[PDB]
Amino acid sequence: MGVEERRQQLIGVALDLFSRRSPDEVSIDEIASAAGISRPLVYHYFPGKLSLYEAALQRASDDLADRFVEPRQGPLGARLLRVMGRYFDFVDEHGPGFSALMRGGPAVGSTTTNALVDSVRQAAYVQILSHLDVTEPPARLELVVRSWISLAESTALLWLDGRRIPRAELETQLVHDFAALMAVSAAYDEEMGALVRRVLADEPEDGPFGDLVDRLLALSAR
Amino acid sequence: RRQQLIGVALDLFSRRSPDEVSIDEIASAAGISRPLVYHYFPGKLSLYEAALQRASDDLADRFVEPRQGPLGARLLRVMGRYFDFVDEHGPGFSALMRSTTTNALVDSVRQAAYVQILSHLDVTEPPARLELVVRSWISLAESTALLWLDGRRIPRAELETQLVHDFAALMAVSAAYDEEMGALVRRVLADEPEGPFGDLVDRLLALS
């Protein structure tokens, strides 16, 4: 194969291995072997293991960020649920590498890896505001949204540790969590209250939010 | 002297990001020479880690709360101490959250919070759904405090109560679709009036 083909092949092979195992268990020799090339030939394309890991992570990060893009049509909850399906598909596909990267955190990460992870978090933020139709988010809204993004990261990481709860339940849970976090904040702020009322007015009366409220009323045995 | 030096280092590492804290600065503040700091610590990272261990023990100890009265009030009292701590250590906390020893120390605080929450819920064998709710809330609380520190545009009193209501919310969402979680919530609502759960249910009713 040609040079650019080979570079992109190598990034793919690296991404495959770094997805399957923690990065301490992936070697240049294994990457070379999977790619069908010699050890020195890998170093022709990348000067070390970290640069290849970063290149794989760039590809993965671009993939997840693109998965956040969803048409601004129909009830908002359903849009978010669709993105949550793609998000869990991604987490599944990349699980062992995702867990290793995230449970390492910014301390272990290179400046480049931390920047890539942050760029994904920011891509999520931008999409959520687009759907909310907000360009100048107030403080309270920014905190709810960013703290939900942290909640969604945590939920996926906890899911991967044993998969003791079905992903479909967690996807729906994260959608309900978003409504609930926003509703909690609405108590302290009229501007927040108005946004949440508008968002919930866009849900059908027979929708999942409806069913959540019905279930909570039932639990309360009012 | 070694314990005094750790305190001085924690003070400076609390006030500024660690790239802005030098051994010479620690030595001056402690009133000792640069060599005497190296006598106790091989290098800057080891002293950073010692300061973090002290801070981590302080926060974990702040999670201890008597098992008495309504649960929401217990958690609100802990949130007051948590935000006090975050305030006192703001710049250093921000910089840390943005070694494997320091990761281990941070993890040990998250675990301490977990243990205390389950203690109060009177649960020794937490179901998967409860574990995920509690751990995910701990992440939410970490995130909320870090976001608060960036500008302090929202008052801490609001975020403290917001976090208590968020715990009830995360639990409620799970309980709505899981019988075992539903039973736990009902067992746990038997001592709150109409408490964060009741107000949340009223709110979801009223905002819809």
From TrEMBL, chain B:
Q: Which parts of this chain does the entry mark as a DNA-binding region?
A: 22-41
A single GO molecular function term of this UniProt record: transcription cis-regulatory region binding
PROSITE patterns per UniProt = HTH_TETR_1, HTH_TETR_2
| Superkingdom of this protein's organism | Bacteria
Q: SUPFAM superfamilies from the xrefs?
A: Homeodomain-like
Q: Which InterPro entries match?
A: DesT_TetR_C, DNA-bd_HTH_TetR-type_CS, Homeodomain-like_sf, HTH-type_TetR-like_transc_reg, HTH_TetR
Q: Where is the HTH tetR-type domain?
A: 1-59
> Which GO biological-process labels does this protein carry?
regulation of DNA-templated transcription
Q: Which UniProt keywords apply?
A: DNA-binding, Transcription, Transcription regulation
Q: What is this protein called?
A: TetR-family transcriptional regulator
Instruction: Give the organism, scientific name.
Output: Streptomyces coelicolor (strain ATCC BAA-471 / A3(2) / M145)
